[PDB]
Design a protein around this ligand. Structure first.
Ligand SMILES: OC[C@H]1O[C@H](O[C@H]2[C@H](O)[C@@H](O)[C@@H](O)O[C@@H]2CO)[C@H](O)[C@@H](O)[C@@H]1O
Length: 461
């Protein structure tokens, strides 16, 4: 009898290629039509290509331009050269042949089927982090498996993820501080994390608590993040221990063509430590001080991450407020820097919010088990976290094995100092609305629109 046998089905990276081949146990000359049909999980049959005895080749609009149906009557084989592959292609590919009998009737013949998988691992992480290093981990993953690991860093990913991931595809794995994850969890945008005891035991038990919402693990903890006072040791050997002595220092420095302190005033995460130093009466005190700095022309009105960073690295400002991630760019520059305790306000310390960098799996992802493999066996390893850390520092890693190395770093000590003086952010769904309320409040008071008393009024609502 006549039997069709397909081959060439495997795993590939989008943009890659695959040659399917279907050999018959009889001459293709006898066939009228030969063609390729595909079936994806839970879907109807979809013709992709066909070739008639008359040498005419037809294709479906999705594959048109990308796929070519070929035939070799010597080898008694029909081919499908699939170039520039996409995730929509992923399906079981079947070979079909039709034969007119001697009489009026016809015969349809089918094959076993050959599986084609187009898989890409996509990761969303912020641009201020070590995406290049994260890619080096991803490159080792592809060597040991065959899956592509692209690393993306889009602007406003914290508020682009819940919109895109809900409707569209978005990323497989999302990287952000733990505070944003409760809102994703409530909305149903994250898969439940199920790590075995042995993996679970590799990380500090306090770190796991930050990535828990209603008794379910919603992410993998990576590292603890806290803002510290970054200062130029040459321009300022004995930096301010108090916030209230910065105006004096600024007067001194402005005479020599230099600023005292430049940091990101737009993002409320940077201004919150000063605001929360005393506490309400504490928020009113802390903000009024911040307002007086801009009013006394000590700080610029629209001071953002880039002009603050650049100014410090250039050697224009004596101080800056930033996280572990910012250190590598300073090292690149020729600035003898120091990381220390944040200045105190009204005697009491400035309480910076503490973030736990965490990796979560998108609920609407087909690569949930592949991402778990990447996160556990490749990223959350000594070797894996090292790679990320040499690009842009992670801070105090969640890995137990890294304690000695963390403790040997003076900047980590300063980070932990500030983290103890601060507090971990609750993961709750209301954090988004909270942060927005503070973002507006600080900008309005900074520019000169709303009063300090009226800012806390609108923010408490
Ligand atoms: O600015 C408010 C913003 O702050 C925090 O985001 C931090 C993030 O945690 C850090 O890793 C760093 O990259 O900067 C961000 C602020 O610029 C909160 O995690 C976030 O929810 C909040 O929107």
């Amino acid at each position: 009898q006549r039997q069709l046998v397909e081959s060439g089905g495997g795993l590939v990276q989008p943009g890659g290629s695959l040659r399917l081949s279907c050999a018959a146990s009889g001459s293709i000359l006898y066939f009228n039509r030969m063609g390729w049909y595909r079936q994806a999980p839970g879907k109807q049959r979809e013709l992709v290509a066909a070739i008639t005895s008359g040498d005419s080749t037809n294709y479906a609009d999705p594959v048109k331009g990308r796929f070519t149906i070929s035939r070799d009557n010597a080898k008694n084989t029909v081919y499908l050269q699939m170039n520039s592959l996409k995730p929509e292609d992923t399906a079981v590919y079947y070979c079909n042949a039709k034969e007119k009998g001697w009489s009026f009737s016809l015969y349809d013949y089918w094959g076993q089927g050959t599986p084609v998988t187009v898989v890409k691992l996509v990761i969303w992480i912020n641009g201020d982090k070590g995406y290049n290093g994260l890619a080096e981990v991803g490159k080792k993953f592809e060597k040991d498996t065959g899956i592509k690991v692209t690393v993306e860093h889009p602007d406003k990913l914290e508020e682009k993820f819940p919109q895109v991931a809900a409707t569209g595809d978005g990323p497989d794995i999302i990287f952000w501080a733990h505070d944003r994850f409760g809102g994703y969890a409530q909305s149903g945008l994250l898969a439940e994390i199920t790590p075995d005891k042995a993996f679970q035991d590799k990380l500090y038990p306090f770190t796991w608590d930050a990535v828990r919402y209603n008794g379910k693990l919603i992410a993998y903890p990576i590292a603890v993040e806290a803002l510290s006072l970054i200062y130029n040791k040459d321009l300022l050997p004995n930096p301010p221990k108090t916030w209230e002595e910065i105006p004096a220092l600024d007067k001194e420095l402005k005479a020599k063509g230099k600023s005292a302190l430049m940091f990101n005033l737009q993002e409320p995460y940077f201004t919150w430590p000063l605001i929360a130093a005393d506490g309400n009466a504490g928020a009113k005190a802390g903000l009024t001080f911040l307002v007086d700095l801009i009013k006394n022309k000590h700080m610029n009105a629209d001071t953002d991450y880039s002009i603050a960073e650049a100014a410090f690295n250039k050697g224009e400002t004596a101080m800056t407020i930033n996280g572990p991630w910012a250190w590598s760019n300073i090292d690149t520059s020729k600035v003898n820097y120091g990381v220390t305790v944040l200045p105190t306000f009204k005697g009491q310390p400035s309480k910076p919010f503490v973030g736990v960098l965490s990796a979560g799996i998108n609920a609407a992802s087909p690569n949930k088990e592949l991402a778990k493999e990447f996160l556990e066996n490749y990223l959350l390893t000594d070797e894996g976290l090292e790679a990320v850390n040499k690009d842009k520092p992670l801070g105090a890693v969640a890995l137990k094995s890294y304690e000695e190395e963390l403790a040997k770093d003076p900047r980590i000590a300063a980070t932990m100092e500030n983290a103890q003086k601060g507090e971990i952010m609750p993961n709750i769904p209301q954090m988004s609305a909270f942060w927005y309320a503070v973002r507006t409040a600080v900008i309005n008071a900074a520019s000169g629109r709303q009063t300090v008393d009226e800012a806390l009024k609108d923010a408490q609502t």
